[PDB]
Amino acid sequence: GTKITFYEDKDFQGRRYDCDCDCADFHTYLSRCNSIKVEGGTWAVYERPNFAGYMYILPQGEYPEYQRWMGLNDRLSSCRAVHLPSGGQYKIQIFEKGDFSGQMYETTEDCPSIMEEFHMREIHSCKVLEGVWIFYELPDYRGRQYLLDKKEYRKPIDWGAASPAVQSFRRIVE
Numbered sequence: 001g002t003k004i005t006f007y008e009d010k011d012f013q014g015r016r017y018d019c020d021c022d023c024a025d026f027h028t029y030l031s032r033c034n035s036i037k038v039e040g041g042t043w044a045v046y047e048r049p050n051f052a053g054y055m056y057i058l059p060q061g062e063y064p065e066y067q068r069w070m071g072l073n074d075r076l077s078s079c080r081a082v083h084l085p086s087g088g089q090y091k092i093q094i095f096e097k098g099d100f101s102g103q104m105y106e107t108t109e110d111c112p113s114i115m116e117e118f119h120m121r122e123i124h125s126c127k128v129l130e131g132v133w134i135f136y137e138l139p140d141y142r143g144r145q146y147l148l149d150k151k152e153y154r155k156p157i158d159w160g161a162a163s164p165a166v167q168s169f170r171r172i173v174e
């Protein structure tokens with residue numbers, strides 16, 4: 001089922017790499033990425049090998065420029081398919097402070113503005129109770145993205161963020 005294609009140049013041109021499973025390192029096959037086709041599944045694609053650096057979530061679709069997936073540069077070199085639980089449930093708890101302290105909020109819905117809904121622009125810890133979610137550094141699902149597909153996150157670095165800025169979040173739905 002799951003299949004993704006990476007191209008070096010815009011508009012599905014240039015050297016190409018295809019992947020139907022996780023790939024921790026494709027840098028030897030491809031030196032840059034400027035377009036992607038996702039034929040099936042939803043994929044997390046990462047700037048550096050072993051799922052490091054900037055990351056981005058792409059559902060099925062055609063992406064003729066990296067700006068189409070909110071890419072931040074022309075570098076990609078690892079990818080993995082997002083596993084959506086068959087049960088189809090989503091619930092997250094967000095916390096004001098690290099280590100699950102401070103004010104907590106629980107939700108099963110998306111949040112395009114944490115400031116509007118919860119009066120925060122940083123989240124310092126999180127429990128993903130059900131499902132798979134994405135945190136964004138900017139409002140309304142803009143900017144750098146962080147995949148939350150583990151259960152517990154005691155500090156922002158646990159979701160890959162050097163910054164505590166989180167201004168929106170949403171679920172990855174099938």
Ligand SMILES: [Mg+2]
Nearest residue numbers: 110111112117
């Ligand atoms: Mg709302």
